[PDB]
């Protein structure tokens, strides 16, 4: 639902968001957290279909080796 | 034998008819070792032949005078003599001759001069020889082109000026046309050598690439002429870092993968280096090299290479590119294992390996760890304790190589992925690393914070571990990162804080 009318609902709201991002990034959620997401499917939907995004665990991009001075 | 001086006189006559009859005779004497020395010793004579050849309007005399010079250029005295009497500007003008004869003699004499006569190179450039030679590359007489291209290589070697001129005349497109059109070994060789010299010039490099140079040279990598193959490979390596946006590379890539199995260590070294550059940020090439069994070729090439970092470093960097960011990425990661490459990869993290190779080896372990089936094998290969040793030493070096900050990021990053497996987490924790990871959260470097928080986040998925992390004073440094602009740092930092509850 709406943002949050209490510290408590602010927490849940943020926790759901973080758990959704954590998973989008490739990390697994704990059993406790999976249960949490079910308990607030209401909150999960609100910022799921309307407030999506992508992710990335870690990285190690590609470098282009150079080879100069020959002839 | 004082006939030389009478001919010199005749050659300078007014009646072209005799000027001709004289050119025939000089040319004939030009063939005898005795008659020829007399000619190359009278600067009056040689100077007559030149002016004549250059100003005459009778083809027979243009060919005869030209041939005579071609004969004298055979000896030391002959060359100095032609040079001293302004032969070069002359011969250069003759490159414009419409006769396939006067032309062959002119380019051949010039070749002799460029090869031996001191002061020859500058004179030819001076007379605009480079421009005429390049315009001459549209001929189809392979022997002629072989001579011509070789003059260009002589004139371009270590001379930026000449190169740019060759570039302004469309030398790269003509040279590339040759590599795609002819099969005469000597020509392909002399031409590949002109491209090699031109490929070290940052402005020529892009032009050769756009003319289809990568593909053109890729055509001769399996040729029996070993000197032809080597020259194309060298040129290919010099151009590779500027050809990572080209299409129609299927053939070259496949051939390159096959060249990895060669017994010629310089072939393998070059092929590896070229593949490394071409798979760097080009998923198209990554998928292709994978479809043609590149992972196996690369793993086999590393096993055989041993401690030869000239081969393993490019190979490992190529394997790293092929194990991330492309549809076949997950398959390659898995393929590296199936072909017995994990043990060799992990080994490379240890001495005698140097930092560049260790840095590249870390990035690959990191990619290989993305595939859960590599989690245990990498562990059983002793990867974890070694990655922690590199990290710990790079970090202490930093708090007091090739940038130890990078080793710190790569090792922590590799451990972050490896921590996805329960047994790996137990090992990472038994190595007493949590205090270090918590310390890493205070790094000024954003990329270090992300991987530090990430590994702490993976470890925290276990209750006992999450409690030790909290007990290690992680809460303060983590909270200070909750407002990071880096979604990664912010997310992981929040995750640990939530898990410690």
XYZ file of C-alpha atoms in Angstrom:
572
model
C 0.000 0.000 0.000
C 0.930 3.675 0.534
C 4.404 4.536 1.961
C 3.908 4.045 5.716
C 2.055 5.591 8.648
C 4.496 4.311 11.301
C 8.162 3.457 11.940
C 7.040 -0.183 11.898
C 5.356 0.005 8.493
C 8.323 1.989 7.208
C 10.619 -0.867 8.256
C 8.524 -3.554 6.556
C 8.247 -1.384 3.464
C 12.037 -1.046 3.308
C 12.721 -4.684 4.197
C 10.485 -5.880 1.354
C 12.271 -3.574 -1.090
C 15.727 -4.726 0.041
C 14.792 -8.434 -0.102
C 13.402 -7.904 -3.631
C 16.635 -6.214 -4.776
C 18.849 -8.755 -3.013
C 17.103 -11.517 -4.936
C 17.181 -9.610 -8.221
C 20.970 -9.381 -7.724
C 21.454 -13.151 -7.565
C 21.667 -13.749 -3.809
C 19.409 -16.287 -2.097
C 16.971 -15.322 0.613
C 16.778 -17.118 3.935
C 13.768 -19.247 4.941
C 12.776 -16.559 7.449
C 12.865 -13.912 4.691
C 10.901 -16.042 2.234
C 8.205 -16.353 4.874
C 8.321 -12.606 5.495
C 7.660 -11.969 1.804
C 4.584 -14.185 1.977
C 3.294 -12.454 5.101
C 3.392 -9.147 3.209
C 2.551 -10.228 -0.311
C 0.355 -7.172 -0.093
C 3.416 -4.959 0.237
C 5.384 -7.124 -2.218
C 2.842 -6.496 -4.996
C 2.649 -2.722 -4.443
C 6.357 -2.187 -5.148
C 6.726 -5.154 -7.491
C 4.578 -4.410 -10.541
C 4.685 -0.631 -10.044
C 8.255 -0.090 -8.733
C 10.522 -2.649 -10.555
C 14.236 -2.618 -11.532
C 17.238 -4.874 -12.388
C 20.419 -6.016 -10.641
C 24.030 -7.267 -10.514
C 25.847 -9.348 -7.858
C 29.503 -8.361 -8.407
C 31.673 -7.742 -11.532
C 35.035 -8.030 -13.355
C 34.645 -6.344 -16.774
C 36.779 -7.038 -19.854
C 40.033 -5.200 -20.625
C 41.535 -4.818 -24.124
C 45.232 -5.752 -24.151
C 47.325 -3.493 -26.401
C 50.291 -4.588 -28.546
C 52.428 -1.712 -29.896
C 55.884 -0.958 -31.351
C 56.668 -3.735 -33.873
C 57.639 -3.328 -37.559
C 88.250 -0.485 -75.450
C 87.706 3.294 -75.521
C 84.339 2.780 -77.207
C 82.517 3.979 -74.085
C 83.248 7.673 -74.777
C 82.075 7.518 -78.403
C 78.734 6.015 -77.340
C 78.324 8.683 -74.661
C 78.640 11.186 -77.502
C 76.135 9.361 -79.716
C 73.571 9.078 -76.912
C 73.489 12.865 -76.591
C 73.009 13.358 -80.349
C 70.166 15.404 -81.877
C 68.898 12.701 -84.244
C 66.827 10.410 -82.024
C 67.447 7.676 -84.597
C 71.110 7.452 -83.545
C 70.369 8.183 -79.896
C 68.383 4.954 -80.246
C 70.994 2.827 -82.022
C 73.370 3.868 -79.228
C 70.995 2.816 -76.421
C 70.846 -0.638 -78.013
C 74.630 -0.943 -77.915
C 75.136 0.442 -74.409
C 72.553 -2.067 -73.218
C 74.395 -4.892 -74.995
C 77.741 -3.958 -73.392
C 75.761 -3.699 -70.175
C 75.543 -7.505 -70.194
C 79.286 -8.296 -70.206
C 81.102 -8.139 -66.858
C 83.865 -6.192 -68.611
C 81.767 -3.841 -70.740
C 79.531 -3.152 -67.735
C 82.324 -2.005 -65.400
C 83.498 0.519 -67.974
C 79.986 1.954 -68.129
C 79.583 2.275 -64.358
C 82.976 3.994 -64.139
C 82.366 6.838 -66.548
C 79.900 9.206 -64.845
C 79.700 10.928 -68.233
C 78.142 7.773 -69.732
C 75.770 6.910 -66.879
C 74.633 10.532 -66.850
C 73.897 10.238 -70.572
C 71.766 7.104 -70.188
C 69.676 8.752 -67.457
C 68.914 12.047 -69.215
C 68.127 10.026 -72.366
C 65.847 7.455 -70.697
C 64.025 10.310 -68.963
C 63.564 12.590 -71.981
C 63.318 10.135 -74.867
C 60.061 9.470 -76.709
C 61.015 6.143 -78.280
C 59.868 3.133 -76.258
C 62.766 0.953 -77.399
C 65.245 3.486 -76.003
C 63.167 3.989 -72.874
C 63.349 0.226 -72.291
C 67.001 -0.148 -73.285
C 68.262 2.771 -71.191
C 66.144 1.551 -68.273
C 67.465 -1.982 -68.590
C 71.081 -0.794 -68.717
C 70.541 0.997 -65.413
C 68.862 -2.070 -63.979
C 72.054 -3.951 -64.838
C 74.487 -1.454 -63.344
C 72.415 -1.336 -60.128
C 73.704 -4.859 -59.613
C 77.062 -3.516 -58.331
C 78.161 -1.097 -55.605
C 79.662 1.319 -58.158
C 76.636 1.105 -60.411
C 74.283 2.176 -57.615
C 76.376 5.098 -56.381
C 76.769 6.133 -60.018
C 73.024 6.155 -60.763
C 72.357 7.974 -57.502
C 75.026 10.642 -58.041
C 73.724 11.435 -61.525
C 70.166 12.097 -60.381
C 68.954 8.646 -61.360
C 66.287 8.452 -58.641
C 64.134 11.409 -59.706
C 64.498 9.913 -63.180
C 63.486 6.356 -62.320
C 60.576 7.755 -60.295
C 59.241 9.601 -63.338
C 59.514 6.348 -65.296
C 57.076 4.667 -62.913
C 54.531 6.562 -64.971
C 55.599 4.807 -68.161
C 52.679 3.116 -69.981
C 54.926 0.186 -70.926
C 55.112 -3.070 -68.937
C 58.868 -3.239 -69.376
C 60.129 0.268 -68.736
C 58.001 -0.081 -65.615
C 59.545 -3.349 -64.438
C 63.078 -1.934 -64.857
C 62.280 1.325 -63.103
C 60.763 -0.311 -60.004
C 63.493 -2.961 -59.920
C 66.317 -0.421 -60.073
C 64.607 1.700 -57.435
C 64.301 -1.422 -55.294
C 68.019 -2.052 -55.622
C 68.713 1.568 -54.718
C 66.399 1.537 -51.669
C 67.943 -1.746 -50.538
C 71.579 -0.710 -50.850
C 72.240 2.919 -51.818
C 72.591 5.252 -48.816
C 70.497 8.377 -49.269
C 68.105 6.460 -51.524
C 65.069 6.401 -49.243
C 64.937 10.185 -48.750
C 65.410 10.891 -52.454
C 62.527 8.618 -53.414
C 60.153 10.246 -50.896
C 61.440 13.596 -52.108
C 60.446 12.814 -55.701
C 57.028 11.574 -54.663
C 57.880 7.912 -55.069
C 55.458 6.819 -52.354
C 52.485 8.293 -54.211
C 53.353 6.646 -57.537
C 54.120 3.283 -55.944
C 50.752 3.192 -54.185
C 48.918 4.197 -57.371
C 50.756 1.267 -58.960
C 49.172 -1.299 -56.596
C 46.211 -1.693 -58.968
C 48.330 -3.653 -61.469
C 47.895 -7.426 -61.632
C 51.428 -8.664 -62.373
C 52.207 -10.426 -59.081
C 55.977 -10.210 -59.511
C 55.684 -6.471 -60.126
C 53.418 -5.961 -57.095
C 55.811 -8.019 -54.943
C 58.673 -5.693 -55.905
C 56.476 -2.595 -55.471
C 55.026 -3.495 -52.063
C 58.517 -4.276 -50.837
C 59.713 -0.777 -51.781
C 56.830 0.563 -49.686
C 57.915 -1.526 -46.696
C 61.464 -0.209 -47.005
C 60.295 3.377 -47.280
C 57.751 3.064 -44.449
C 59.868 1.324 -41.825
C 60.413 3.616 -38.842
C 59.141 6.599 -40.795
C 55.846 8.108 -39.617
C 55.942 10.696 -42.383
C 56.019 8.092 -45.168
C 53.300 6.097 -43.422
C 50.857 9.002 -43.258
C 51.540 9.638 -46.936
C 50.851 5.976 -47.678
C 47.634 6.412 -45.683
C 46.571 9.529 -47.611
C 46.974 7.619 -50.880
C 44.717 4.812 -49.719
C 47.561 2.423 -49.105
C 45.656 0.293 -46.593
C 42.682 -0.372 -48.877
C 44.984 -1.311 -51.783
C 47.196 -3.497 -49.592
C 44.116 -5.216 -48.184
C 42.765 -5.732 -51.710
C 45.979 -7.559 -52.532
C 45.722 -9.922 -49.523
C 42.222 -10.877 -50.706
C 42.922 -11.178 -54.439
C 46.259 -12.906 -55.008
C 47.795 -16.251 -54.183
C 51.473 -15.620 -55.001
C 53.263 -16.331 -51.679
C 56.041 -13.789 -52.100
C 53.557 -11.001 -52.766
C 51.275 -11.928 -49.875
C 54.378 -11.952 -47.711
C 55.892 -8.610 -48.755
C 52.405 -7.076 -48.522
C 51.702 -8.523 -45.068
C 54.975 -6.959 -44.020
C 53.911 -3.526 -45.284
C 50.742 -3.940 -43.211
C 52.788 -5.003 -40.193
C 54.891 -1.843 -40.375
C 51.746 0.250 -40.897
C 49.854 -1.509 -38.092
C 52.007 0.102 -35.347
C 50.929 3.621 -36.456
C 47.852 4.582 -34.401
C 46.342 6.482 -37.354
C 46.990 3.775 -39.931
C 45.695 1.056 -37.594
C 42.043 2.200 -37.801
C 42.217 2.574 -41.591
C 43.523 -0.971 -42.112
C 40.763 -2.308 -39.866
C 38.018 -0.481 -41.789
C 39.361 -1.773 -45.118
C 38.642 -5.313 -43.941
C 42.186 -5.985 -42.759
C 41.309 -8.378 -39.935
C 39.356 -10.685 -42.232
C 41.800 -10.318 -45.156
C 44.788 -11.455 -43.070
C 42.692 -14.133 -41.398
C 42.548 -15.785 -44.834
C 46.200 -16.865 -44.738
C 46.586 -18.223 -41.177
C 46.680 -21.835 -42.397
C 48.986 -21.235 -45.326
C 52.032 -23.543 -45.539
C 54.355 -20.519 -45.721
C 55.313 -20.137 -42.068
C 56.732 -16.659 -42.661
C 53.410 -15.609 -44.216
C 51.407 -16.929 -41.267
C 53.667 -15.302 -38.648
C 53.536 -11.878 -40.349
C 49.750 -11.927 -40.583
C 49.462 -12.992 -36.924
C 51.766 -10.202 -35.710
C 49.827 -7.628 -37.719
C 46.594 -9.193 -36.460
C 47.688 -8.744 -32.859
C 48.635 -5.082 -33.440
C 45.209 -4.385 -34.935
C 43.096 -6.506 -32.578
C 42.688 -3.889 -29.848
C 41.069 -1.648 -32.473
C 38.818 -4.214 -34.140
C 36.418 -5.131 -31.336
C 33.457 -3.623 -33.210
C 33.828 -5.480 -36.536
C 31.349 -8.030 -37.919
C 32.018 -10.882 -40.349
C 34.786 -12.249 -38.151
C 33.439 -15.832 -37.966
C 36.260 -17.263 -40.076
C 39.197 -15.542 -38.376
C 37.892 -16.405 -34.887
C 37.484 -20.077 -35.777
C 40.926 -20.267 -37.362
C 42.410 -18.534 -34.323
C 40.897 -21.173 -32.019
C 42.441 -23.906 -34.155
C 45.803 -22.128 -34.135
C 45.804 -22.608 -30.355
C 46.612 -26.274 -30.944
C 49.773 -25.426 -32.883
C 53.203 -26.680 -31.829
C 54.751 -23.331 -32.770
C 54.801 -21.455 -29.454
C 54.697 -18.075 -31.214
C 51.568 -19.063 -33.082
C 49.794 -20.054 -29.862
C 51.042 -16.919 -28.047
C 49.737 -14.623 -30.795
C 46.452 -16.501 -31.322
C 45.792 -16.287 -27.590
C 46.560 -12.559 -27.473
C 44.366 -11.849 -30.495
C 41.443 -13.890 -29.129
C 41.799 -12.108 -25.809
C 41.379 -8.694 -27.449
C 38.556 -9.735 -29.823
C 36.413 -11.285 -27.088
C 36.856 -8.217 -24.886
C 33.401 -6.558 -24.755
C 31.869 -8.169 -27.834
C 29.377 -10.901 -26.951
C 29.071 -11.637 -30.658
C 32.712 -12.802 -30.756
C 32.352 -14.484 -27.360
C 29.499 -16.666 -28.607
C 31.324 -17.510 -31.815
C 34.582 -18.504 -30.102
C 32.434 -20.639 -27.812
C 30.500 -22.345 -30.613
C 33.801 -23.467 -32.184
C 35.074 -25.105 -28.995
C 37.180 -22.230 -27.711
C 36.903 -23.120 -24.043
C 38.504 -26.506 -24.594
C 41.141 -25.069 -26.878
C 41.913 -22.431 -24.273
C 41.978 -24.811 -21.326
C 44.228 -27.218 -23.233
C 46.492 -24.316 -24.228
C 46.887 -23.309 -20.561
C 47.710 -26.829 -19.361
C 50.512 -27.142 -21.931
C 51.781 -23.568 -21.477
C 52.901 -24.305 -17.928
C 54.486 -21.302 -16.220
C 54.737 -19.516 -19.583
C 52.901 -16.306 -18.743
C 53.273 -15.158 -22.360
C 50.663 -17.781 -23.170
C 48.676 -18.230 -19.953
C 48.003 -14.556 -19.289
C 46.204 -13.950 -22.646
C 44.518 -17.344 -22.475
C 43.258 -16.743 -18.917
C 42.059 -13.255 -19.934
C 40.239 -14.810 -22.908
C 38.645 -17.444 -20.677
C 37.541 -14.679 -18.340
C 35.834 -12.749 -21.139
C 34.061 -15.936 -22.302
C 32.689 -16.708 -18.887
C 30.620 -13.553 -18.395
C 27.972 -11.417 -20.079
C 26.659 -13.378 -23.070
C 24.099 -16.147 -23.667
C 26.735 -18.918 -23.563
C 28.419 -17.510 -20.424
C 26.920 -20.121 -18.097
C 27.855 -22.932 -20.505
C 31.497 -21.789 -20.738
C 31.807 -21.546 -16.959
C 30.581 -25.113 -16.813
C 32.723 -26.139 -19.809
C 35.940 -25.015 -18.117
C 35.290 -27.664 -15.471
C 34.257 -30.460 -17.841
C 37.591 -30.076 -19.628
C 39.759 -30.412 -16.511
C 40.716 -26.752 -16.243
C 39.834 -25.944 -12.614
C 42.990 -27.410 -11.081
C 45.225 -25.556 -13.518
C 43.305 -22.293 -13.030
C 43.571 -22.440 -9.246
C 47.236 -23.377 -9.485
C 48.013 -20.182 -11.398
C 47.158 -18.182 -8.258
C 50.445 -19.398 -6.793
C 54.104 -18.527 -7.510
C 55.945 -18.266 -9.906
C 52.899 -16.398 -11.183
C 53.256 -12.621 -11.418
C 50.602 -10.062 -10.460
C 49.126 -9.455 -13.918
C 48.422 -13.173 -14.357
C 47.184 -13.570 -10.766
C 44.861 -10.619 -11.201
C 43.451 -12.164 -14.375
C 43.227 -15.578 -12.697
C 41.178 -14.108 -9.841
C 38.658 -12.557 -12.221
C 38.153 -15.948 -13.862
C 37.653 -17.818 -10.564
C 35.093 -15.131 -9.822
C 33.276 -15.910 -13.099
C 33.635 -19.678 -12.748
C 32.097 -19.461 -9.267
C 28.857 -18.120 -10.773
C 28.111 -21.725 -11.768
C 27.158 -23.733 -8.617
C 28.760 -26.880 -10.037
C 32.182 -25.159 -9.704
C 31.670 -24.283 -6.021
C 32.916 -27.564 -4.557
C 35.659 -28.269 -7.148
C 37.165 -24.819 -6.633
C 37.072 -25.394 -2.871
C 38.705 -28.804 -3.162
C 41.382 -27.194 -5.284
C 42.381 -25.055 -2.290
C 41.190 -21.785 -3.818
C 39.673 -20.212 -0.699
C 42.712 -20.106 1.622
C 44.833 -18.741 -1.250
C 42.318 -16.044 -2.198
C 42.250 -15.003 1.470
C 46.042 -14.905 1.618
C 46.252 -12.604 -1.421
C 43.515 -10.397 0.039
C 45.093 -10.149 3.488
C 48.552 -9.356 2.105
C 47.276 -6.887 -0.496
C 45.283 -5.114 2.199
C 48.217 -4.872 4.616
C 50.419 -3.614 1.799
C 47.744 -0.975 1.114
C 47.631 0.038 4.789
C 51.375 0.724 4.853
C 52.789 -4.886 -7.654
C 50.053 -3.672 -10.014
C 47.792 -1.770 -7.614
C 47.071 -3.840 -4.521
C 43.660 -2.183 -4.281
C 42.595 -4.239 -7.321
C 43.740 -7.518 -5.817
C 41.754 -6.586 -2.697
C 38.613 -6.065 -4.797
C 39.058 -9.117 -6.973
C 39.744 -11.509 -4.110
C 36.924 -10.180 -1.951
C 34.759 -10.244 -5.061
C 35.651 -13.874 -5.798
C 34.968 -14.866 -2.188
C 31.611 -13.089 -2.359
C 30.453 -15.387 -5.173
C 32.073 -18.455 -3.591
C 30.164 -17.699 -0.371
C 26.914 -18.755 -2.081
C 27.746 -22.324 -1.078
C 27.298 -23.454 2.531
C 30.526 -25.460 2.820
C 32.493 -22.576 1.285
C 31.042 -20.209 3.888
C 32.180 -22.516 6.672
C 35.697 -22.449 5.193
C 35.717 -18.686 4.655
C 34.660 -18.175 8.265
C 37.061 -20.702 9.778
C 39.815 -18.692 8.129
C 38.936 -15.921 10.598
C 38.163 -13.354 7.886
C 35.048 -11.614 9.232
C 37.042 -8.941 11.085
C 38.824 -8.156 7.819
C 35.588 -7.918 5.819
C 34.130 -5.593 8.428
C 37.302 -3.479 8.200
C 36.924 -3.380 4.417
C 33.638 -1.492 4.785
C 35.703 1.631 5.675
C 37.450 1.565 2.324
C 37.292 4.876 0.392
C 36.806 2.714 -2.718
C 33.161 2.084 -3.584
C 33.858 -1.203 -5.391
C 35.563 -2.530 -2.257
C 32.581 -1.579 -0.115
C 30.192 -3.398 -2.422
C 32.095 -6.711 -2.344
C 32.902 -6.385 1.368
C 29.209 -5.863 2.223
C 28.257 -8.556 -0.295
C 30.444 -11.269 1.206
C 29.212 -10.247 4.648
C 25.678 -10.514 3.275
C 26.191 -14.043 1.953
C 27.762 -15.177 5.215
C 24.899 -13.632 7.161
C 22.405 -16.003 5.521
C 23.384 -18.447 8.327
C 22.184 -17.522 11.843
C 25.433 -18.275 13.703
C 27.474 -16.312 11.175
C 25.119 -13.313 11.166
C 25.570 -13.113 14.938
C 29.368 -13.153 14.796
C 29.278 -10.382 12.171
C 27.147 -8.245 14.505
C 29.407 -9.157 17.418
C 32.270 -7.947 15.248
C 30.963 -4.387 15.300
C 29.610 -4.398 11.734
C 26.462 -2.389 12.515
C 28.056 1.072 12.584
C 30.106 0.873 9.371
C 27.176 -0.848 7.623
C 24.695 1.872 8.615
C 27.038 4.570 7.316
C 26.724 2.873 3.886
C 22.904 2.703 3.768
C 22.849 5.994 1.845
C 25.451 4.995 -0.754
C 24.592 6.044 -4.315
C 25.657 2.539 -5.321
C 22.457 0.446 -5.200
C 24.688 -2.580 -4.611
C 26.406 -1.207 -1.479
C 23.097 0.114 -0.135
C 21.248 -3.145 -0.715
C 23.885 -5.483 0.747
C 24.499 -3.189 3.684
C 20.750 -3.198 4.431
C 20.556 -6.980 4.011
C 23.254 -7.611 6.637
C 21.570 -5.208 9.038
C 18.238 -6.957 8.523
C 19.827 -10.403 8.931
C 21.456 -9.430 12.241
C 17.916 -9.435 13.677
